[PDB]
Amino acid sequence: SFSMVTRYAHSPEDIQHYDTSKLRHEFLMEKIFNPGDILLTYTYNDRMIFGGVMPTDEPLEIKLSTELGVDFFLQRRELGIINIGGAGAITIDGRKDAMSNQDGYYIGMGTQKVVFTSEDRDHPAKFYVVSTPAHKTYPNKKLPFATALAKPMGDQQHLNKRTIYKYIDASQMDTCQLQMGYTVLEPGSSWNTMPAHTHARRMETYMYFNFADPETRVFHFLGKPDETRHITLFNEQAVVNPSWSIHCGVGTTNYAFIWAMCGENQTYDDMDQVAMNEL
Template sequence: MEIRYPAHPEAFKTYTTDRLRQEYLIEKLFEPGQINLVYSHVDRIIVGGVCPTDAALTLEAGKELGAEYFLERREMGAINIGGAGTITLDGETFSLGPRDGIYIGKGIKEVAFASVDKAAPAKFYCNSAPAHAAYPTKKVGLADARQVHLGSLEESNKRIIYQYVHPDVLQSCQLVMGMTILEPCNVWNTMPCHTHERRMEVYLYFDLPEKAVVFHFTGEPTETRHIIVRNEQAVISPSYSIHSGVGTTNYTFIWGMVGENQTFTDMDHVPMSELR
């Protein structure tokens, strides 16, 4: 498990492109036959990619958590962006097709990931946060997620937000997680932008062709920077940072938030005139 540490906004301003990428970009999440995890001390979120092939992969706690098992004091959400797969939780198996998700509550001891076909492996994208209570595990398919339609073709940001781990869908401690799909010919996400001091956020960008990129904007609204992001890469955003992007084509991204509340609309909107 890789460990990442937070930075003060004043330090953030001084970072070079390489330093920004080193601290906030997660470049390799999905490697065949592996579990890759990044533990960020920004609200103690864990971001993971699981790509089982020949055999099932079991989630282990490791010394970094100081726990007997991974979800002893944590909850987790997972969304499958690959081929069909399964997640087995304390002996109960859940089938997850492409873009199906699941919420896994605190206290589940065994978490095992598998692919139905190793030639078309599942790719489970996971977000995990500390949890104070145990809530029921629940599978959430794409059709079960709460939909919010936003944007317009004129603003190049027409999109559908699918809320998987959300108070209107299921109960969790602090984790909120979902997926946004941009329609063809639309390239902007989360613009006009916002911050939310109460929560941090992580984006996973995918459904990008090999030569396509997303310019992900980060930093304080008056001190913006950008990070070039490619297919199946994730970006960590501290609470003081904006988190928006524009692609060379349309794309899909998964967002996950942890922090003080679960109020999706709790945002500090930034007037376009104040961006720098």
């Protein structure tokens, strides 16, 4: 009950006649949180590894050495974490730090052992993890939801009314590549990232969760700004957006998602806002 599947990169021109079911196979991770299991995917867009760890009875660790050609998982890599589930803790090189809901952690390169645990076996913590390669070691930082920064954004005229939470951000901390965040749209608002953009120099991954209703749906937009497609998401699913693709979404109700951005730069404003011509 450990899984890591591989996904490739593509030309924009490669996906152009792609059907939905194969669009979903290349870009969408359908199952992320299954009790007791580790579910991760390895994308060749800047080699991001993301997925989820849901420990229940016995604690879990992402144990990967030979597969990545190293002796331990984070020998050459950094790792972000946000817990969207129940109460838990992670022990990091022995230091056990409790993790309550929407608490996050940045763990830099060189950390040998990271064990995730849950406190209650039937109300587990859901650890959404993102690991990205790192050439320099930076300090570990716990990112409490209490300390988590809340920025008002949106109007109801644009149906984007929401609150963004910065977790791993270059202005508040030092990492190599990884940037992480969390967005809750308020009820009555469905649009995320709507005035849209592409960033040639880095990529992003959206993971949608906490759907308002069991029947809620998210339509995540994808593709090159002139040629766009969409994928339809159930709760707790994720979509890799390559550097040449835009990324936005709409729900039938409100929801939340975590964004994880990485690439060769951390500059936030190296990006092209797509004017509204999208065919």
